[PDB]
């Protein structure tokens, strides 16, 4: 049970089918400790199946090709004319939970209700794999019509909703969830045509009109353990109905979960909101307009059935005001999942609810300043800025008009998780409310009045989320305001920045007197408001130093010290030398004590100070007419020193640490002391630090290093930038070891050259010999689509430097890649991968593409075998990207004069040739 989660020479496809027949004999071997052992092993091999085993069971013959209480002929898992998953549902039922004569319960005396609970969860995970098993007859050869009047099918599994305890009526609550999830995805929402084929084959009368009222009932069940298991059944089942033909019954199950919002079991309320986060409320608003009886429903109501304003004001924002710290956190992550899915009425884009569903399915199928803020013109969706400004309207309203401690406290946690997925600087027209009335300062005036109260900072679980959100709302004014604090330039904005920079030097002043046991500009002595903040940072630090647990994300001081050095960073960008010149004394004393607890983001506090101490639309538009004209427009273009105590301490850490989040922020602190020309006196006598970077290349090639991936792009930026003062002869011998003698390329070898090529091709006779060396290495690596972004840099300099040299180099990679595209060695598996290769044939010189002798022998090819969708997928990407050349780079006249000479027969891939490859 621990290794099947990891199975997804290799473990063979005939090794895994020996595991599976071993258990069906052991679901019958009598015990109560041995029957329960092979039934937890079967529930998990269908949920996370190994992909070799997974195709041998859905297949029709199945095990027959690999070899070359029950009282009837079931038909074993060797027989043909039926899948083995048709076989495996007949077997686990007549032994455990069904008697082959009549729709009748089996007694709990015979089989335990701990043993009947794991047998209802194994019949459900196979229907998601092979849905034709549930409609089958129980016995293959019928059982004795003299004794029993009628034979029954496996639909008496769905009579265990009335059986007694939880986890049987709750595990037949989940057996109807994935029977509806996996008929719609099996036959593509054709519930009309697919049900006809079964009924003349196995004569049961079981529609999906007789299971949703069995699923509507267990949502209304009494026990709070019975209600946790019936609302995970609607996570699987209401995204498949609501876009299907049964979407009359699909809307009703959206309605009933809304009544389950006020039950008093804390696990019942958080699996509601995940089935209200996965709802597409632009597809849900479409069914309301079509309804006339469903608006009435029971008791003949008059008015509109407003699902959206009732599921967003009275659940998701309402469950922010819950008492539990478990229930408040899960409701924030849904407003990250609801905002792209709203459809409020009458935008200036999507008008109807018909036109709303059509734009989320066409983007799918038709195609250094600090982290806070932005300076671009910021191209943005006009209608996606409207759904994000109605979710920050009802959220700043249960924070100001609220009357409880619990509404103010868990709605500053739902505003910090918007701004890390929907940032303020990019979506500023959604966040804008008032301030500067036009690039915005949205809503940041209320939240400073929360922090300056002596009530709200006294608990570190949500005072650390009100500091990451007040630095996102004073940085979105940076593209506007910048031309005390002379760089702010907006005097209605200075008291918001005077306060946080006064608020963030008094919270690195209480974290300095806590990490060092010292008795109590930035000063918290004379304030009685911040002597309350000294007894709260000292309760969370007596539990760390006493209880050893290193790998915790949530620590509430180690989580709280991460929050107030992230936002002391983002303000110094707005500051200048003149404002900080009386405070370079101040902020450097605190960090020497604030270094040992969290040095990963205590140099991000030091990386920034040195910058600013040294200055630095109507369903014809959307489906066709807007994507048809991005096609033809890119074709006409295809026809074209107080740091000296603090700096020495950070170098002793890199030699002795092991966490590789800390090793990455120390290689950016030293690429800034060489640009800003600090003389190479960090190592006054010896070369102590530069000798240690060479040894780390020994541990990556062999593989004796744990997290080389997140350090190998930043190891190589430090080395090339020193050589302008280890020289570029020595730098390129280190990169050749990793590639041929070491791990794979898309983590180590391909991010290794992004620092070199950008710092060698972009920026006399010694420089000519080293450019021949770097171009030969990539020809061994053309196969990867990240290596094809590095080579669009190479072709644009030769058109600028020397146009005689520009045409020689586009001919050498013409006859390498076109032999690869016919033999499918080019990894074009992504849609990040087809975008890189089409901007290549524009920039490749047209003299190398002018004979059409080469582009056609690379076009009209047959792959090796088209059995596998790893191999079907790379043959149809070679035909789409050499056909963007025969339309722009050469007209119609040149192409067809050639095929008269080259005998390219039209029987190349014909219906006789395509049939022998999928099988072969």
């Amino acid at each position: 049970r621990y290794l099947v989660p990891l199975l997804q020479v290799s473990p063979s496809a005939e090794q895994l089918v020996q595991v599976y027949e071993l258990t069906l004999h052991h679901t019958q071997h009598q015990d109560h400790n041995v029957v329960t052992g092979a039934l937890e092993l079967l529930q998990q091999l269908f949920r996370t199946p190994p992909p070799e085993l997974l195709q041998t069971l859905t297949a029709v013959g199945g095990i027959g090709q690999l070899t070359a209480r029950i009282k009837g002929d079931i038909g074993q898992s060797t027989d043909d004319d039926s899948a083995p998953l048709v076989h495996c549902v007949r077997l686990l039922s007549a032994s455990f939970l069904l008697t082959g004569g009549k729709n009748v319960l089996v007694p709990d005396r015979d089989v335990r209700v701990s043993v009947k609970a794991l047998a209802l969860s194994c019949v459900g995970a196979a229907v998601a794999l092979h849905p034709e098993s549930f409609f089958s007859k129980l016995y293959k050869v019928p059982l004795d019509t003299t004794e029993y009047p009628e034979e029954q099918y496996v639909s008496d599994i769905l009579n265990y909703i009335d059986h007694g305890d939880p986890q049987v009526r709750g595990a037949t609550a989940i057996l109807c969830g994935t029977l509806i999830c996996s008929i719609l995805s099996r036959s593509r929402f054709h519930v009309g045509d697919w049900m006809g084929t079964i009924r003349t084959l196995t004569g049961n009368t079981f529609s999906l009109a007789d299971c949703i009222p069995l699923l509507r009932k267990t949502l209304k069940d009494e026990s709070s353990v019975t209600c946790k298991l019936a609302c995970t059944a609607v996570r699987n089942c209401v995204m498949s109905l609501c876009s299907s033909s049964y979407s009359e019954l699909g809307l009703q199950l959206i309605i009933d979960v809304l009544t389950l919002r006020n039950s008093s079991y804390w696990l019942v309320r958080t699996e509601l909101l995940e089935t209200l986060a996965e709802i597409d409320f632009r597809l849900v608003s479409f069914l309301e307009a079509k309804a006339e009886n469903l608006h009435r429903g029971a008791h003949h109501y008059t008015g509109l059935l407003k699902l959206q304003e009732r599921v967003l004001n009275n659940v998701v924002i309402h469950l922010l005001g819950d008492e539990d710290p478990r229930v408040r956190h899960v409701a924030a992550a849904s407003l990250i999942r609801l905002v792209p899915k709203l459809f409020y009425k009458c935008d200036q884009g999507q008008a109807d609810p018909v036109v709303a569903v059509a734009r989320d399915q066409s983007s799918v199928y038709l195609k250094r300043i600090y982290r806070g803020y932005n300076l671009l013109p910021s191209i943005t969706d006009v209608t996606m800025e409207n759904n994000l400004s109605r979710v920050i309207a009802a959220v700043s309203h249960e924070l100001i008009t609220s009357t409880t401690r619990a509404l103010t406290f868990g709605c500053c946690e739902a505003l910090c998780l918007l701004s890390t997925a929907f940032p303020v600087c990019i979506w500023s027209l959604g966040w804008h409310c008032g301030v500067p009335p036009l690039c915005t300062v949205g809503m940041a005036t209320m939240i400073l009045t929360l922090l300056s109260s002596a009530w709200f900072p006294l608990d570190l679980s949500a005072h650390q989320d009100a500091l990451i959100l007040a630095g996102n709302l004073l940085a979105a004014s940076a593209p506007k305001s910048l031309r005390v604090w002379p760089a702010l330039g907006d005097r209605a904005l200075v008291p918001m920045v005077e306060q946080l920079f006064s608020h963030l030097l008094k919270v690195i002043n209480i974290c300095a007197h806590v990490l060092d046991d010292v008795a109590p500009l930035g000063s918290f002595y004379h304030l009685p408001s911040y002597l309350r903040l000294h007894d709260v940072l000292k309760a969370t630090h007596a539990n760390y130093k006493v209880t050893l647990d290193l790998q915790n994300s949530t620590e509430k001081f180690g989580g709280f010290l991460r929050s107030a050095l992230d936002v002391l960073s983002q303000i110094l960008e707005l500051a200048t030398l003149q404002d900080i010149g009386k405070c370079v004394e101040e902020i450097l004393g605190y960090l020497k004590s604030c270094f040992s607890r969290e040095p990963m983001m205590a140099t991000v506090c030091v990386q920034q100070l040195l910058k600013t101490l040294f200055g630095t639309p109507g369903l014809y538009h959307y489906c066709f007419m807007a994507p048809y004209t991005h096609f033809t427009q890119a074709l006409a273009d295809a026809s074209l020193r107080l740091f000296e105590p603090l700096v020495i301490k950070a170098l002793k850490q890199y030699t002795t640490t092991t966490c590789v989040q800390l090793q990455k922020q120390v290689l950016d602190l030293l690429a800034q002391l060489v640009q800003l020309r600090v003389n190479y006196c960090l190592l006054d006598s010896d070369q102590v630090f530069i000798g240690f970077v060479l040894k780390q290349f020994e541990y990556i090639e062999v593989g004796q290093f744990r997290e080389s991936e997140a350090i190998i792009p930043n190891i190589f930026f430090f080395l090339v930038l020193l050589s302008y003062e280890i020289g570029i002869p020595k730098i390129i011998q280190l990169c050749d070891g990793i590639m041929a003698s070491g791990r794979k390329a898309v983590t180590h070898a391909i991010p290794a050259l992004q620092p070199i090529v950008h710092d060698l091709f972009v920026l006399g006779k010694e420089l000519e010999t080293q450019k021949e060396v770097v171009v030969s290495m990539l020809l061994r690596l053309i196969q990867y689509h990240q290596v094809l972004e590095m080579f669009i840099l190479v072709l644009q300099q030769c058109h600028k430097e020397n146009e005689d040299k520009w045409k020689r180099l586009s001919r050498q990679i013409a006859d390498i890649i076109l032999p690869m595209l016919a033999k499918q060695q080019m990894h074009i598996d992504s849609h990040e991968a087809l975008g890189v290769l089409n901007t290549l044939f524009e920039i490749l010189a047209p003299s190398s593409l002018r004979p059409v002798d080469m582009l056609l022998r690379s076009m009209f090819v047959t792959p090796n075998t088209m059995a596998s969708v790893s191999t079907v997928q790379l043959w149809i990407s070679g035909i789409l990207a050499i056909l963007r050349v025969l339309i722009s780079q050469s007209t119609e006249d040149i192409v067809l004069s050639r095929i008269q000479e080259l005998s390219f027969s039209p029987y190349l891939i014909s219906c006789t040739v395509i049939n022998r490859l999928r099988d072969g």
Binding site: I255, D256, L258, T259, N262, L294, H295, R296, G297, A298, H299, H300, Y301, T302, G303, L305, K306, R310
Partner: protein, 542 residues
């Protein structure tokens, strides 16, 4: 129901039922002010009971089929129903054995119009034959909503369109006063989860006995029984003494606090000037402490009374609060000042400027000035159906032995004794009130400022009915001077009502009226600060 769609369900017969529905709305209102030629006939009294039932069933028949009726025709049909439940003639006929079908069909059809408007699909309101107990369970659900759903201005009241929250609040009260229903509605909902279910028999469906004392010994169970008795009122006088005996056995200190407040509310429903026990029709009597004027009654003076009759009457249609009035009609001017040995009711046009300035226009509630001491002396001749005289002698014995108890129970016992003071009917009864309150102040500490602001209203209304004599003035005059210096702003307000009763009627002592310039000096200082800004300082201190 085959006959009901052809002889009744015609779209020509339906049009009459909102034109005949404005007809019976204005006729039943003026009954309280018509002569006896114009009252409804006794033989034609049956046919106006049967026609409230039949126009409210055409309202439920469109919501199923077509749309809303007109939603002005939601409003004209439920005004024929609110008035037949307020009259003493039409309400008695709905209660009898012959109309079990017609009183249980106004419960199915006012629960159908309130659920098909307020209850969005997939909710509820809040969070024997079958039809009688399907009518009996229907009324328990609707009264718990008046807390949440039908309270004028709640967060839950954004769904009802607020011209029915006057109309549908007055109509759920007067249907649970029916003897078909009333015995079940007083049982709080925490009881039916517990094991209480005796058999009913009263020649009807539900005739449950009253709740025994042993269930009331829990606070959450006791906070829901006191809700059912105030907004519901009571009935014929036999049911008034049933609730009296249940509260006295309750008389652990969390339940000693909340049942001294339940005895305050039972006396005031014997203090009401019409039907006296029905919060549907009526509200508490108040007395003007201002006398009737002298400037009228002359030949130029009788002309004065016609002109300002037109001006004041369309003010209350715009300015006032309609606490008294459910329906939407215009000339509903009704002030419950009685005559006085009580008598008839005085109309609104006759008391033109009697009402005291302490009160918002038409808002009828307790506001410390209900019975002025003008009206004590001429109903009870003393100048220096329930036996309401019986219930007030028993309450003087109980609240003196508790004073002469925890500090939570000290404050709420002085407040229950000041409210019943409307109903003291003897000069023997007012003398015992003043004696218990002065032995407290010398014993109880002076710095208890919750207790300080209920007793300055209490000690001052005694010495007014009593003689304001030289042995009484020197204790009463010294206590009013100190509390006006207090920093507690709701303690400032209770002490100023005690000035009035001393200043009101008694020819006051000559040395003590030189301490009116003690109270004259306080009034000048707090108007110059509350001349410009009134929004800042207060409302009911201003």
């Amino acid at each position: 129901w085959s006959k009901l769609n052809d002889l009744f369900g015609d779209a020509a017969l339906y049009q009459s039922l909102p034109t005949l529905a404005r007809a019976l709305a204005q006729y039943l209102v003026v009954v309280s002010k018509l002569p006896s030629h114009l009252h409804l006939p006794p033989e034609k009294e049956k046919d106006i009971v049967k026609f409230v039932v039949a126009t409210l069933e055409a309202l439920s028949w469109h919501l199923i089929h077509e749309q809303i009726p007109l939603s002005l025709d939601l409003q004209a049909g439920l005004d024929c129903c609110c008035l037949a439940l307020q009259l003493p003639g039409l309400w008695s006929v709905v209660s009898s054995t012959e109309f079990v079908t017609h009183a249980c069909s106004l419960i199915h059809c006012v629960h159908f119009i309130l659920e098909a408007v307020a209850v969005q699909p997939g909710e509820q309101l809040l969070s024997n034959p079958k039809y009688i107990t399907a009518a009996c369970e229907m009324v328990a659900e609707m009264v718990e909503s008046l807390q949440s759903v039908l309270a004028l201005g709640h967060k839950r009241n954004s769904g009802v369109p607020a011209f029915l929250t006057p109309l549908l609040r007055n109509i759920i009260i007067s249907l649970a006063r029916l003897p078909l229903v009333n015995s079940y509605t007083r049982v709080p909902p925490l009881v039916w989860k517990l094991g209480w279910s005796p058999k009913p028999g009263g020649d009807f469906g539900t005739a449950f006995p009253e709740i025994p004392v042993e269930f009331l010994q829990e606070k959450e169970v006791f906070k829901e029984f006191i809700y059912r008795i105030n907004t519901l009122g009571w009935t014929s006088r036999t049911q008034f003494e049933e609730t009296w005996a249940t509260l006295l056995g309750v008389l652990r200190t969390q339940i000693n606090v909340l049942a001294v407040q339940a005895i305050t509310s039972l006396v005031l429903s014997a203090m009401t000037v019409p039907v006296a026990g029905n919060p549907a029709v009526s509200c508490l009597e108040q007395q003007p402490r201002n006398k009737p004027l002298k400037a009228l009654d002359t030949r130029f003076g009788r002309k004065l009374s016609i002109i300002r009759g037109i001006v004041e009457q369309e003010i209350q249609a715009m300015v006032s609060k309609r606490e008294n009035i459910a329906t939407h009609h215009l000339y509903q001017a009704w002030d419950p000042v009685p005559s006085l040995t009580t008598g008839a009711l005085i109309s609104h046009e006759k008391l033109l400027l009697q009402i005291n300035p302490e009160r918002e226009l038409g808002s009828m509630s307790y506001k410390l000035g209900q019975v002025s001491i003008h009206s004590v002396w001429l109903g009870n001749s003393i100048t220096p159906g329930v036996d309401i005289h019986s219930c007030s002698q028993f309450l003087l014995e109980l609240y003196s032995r508790w004073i002469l108890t925890p500090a939570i129970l000290i404050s709420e016992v002085v407040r229950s004794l000041l409210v019943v003071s409307d109903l003291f009917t003897e000069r023997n009864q007012f003398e015992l009130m003043y004696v218990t309150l002065t032995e407290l102040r010398r014993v109880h500490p002076s710095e208890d400022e919750i207790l300080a602001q209920y007793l300055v209203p209490a000690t001052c209304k005694a010495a007014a009915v009593l003689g304001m004599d030289k042995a009484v003035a020197e204790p009463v005059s010294r206590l009013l001077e100190s509390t006006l210096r207090s920093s507690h702003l709701p303690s400032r307000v209770g002490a100023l009502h005690g000035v009035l009763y001393v200043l009101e009627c008694d020819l006051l002592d000559d040395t003590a009226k030189q301490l009116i310039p003690v109270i004259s000096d306080y009034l000048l200082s707090n108007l110059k600060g509350i001349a410009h800004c009134v929004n800042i300082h207060s409302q009911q201190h201003v």
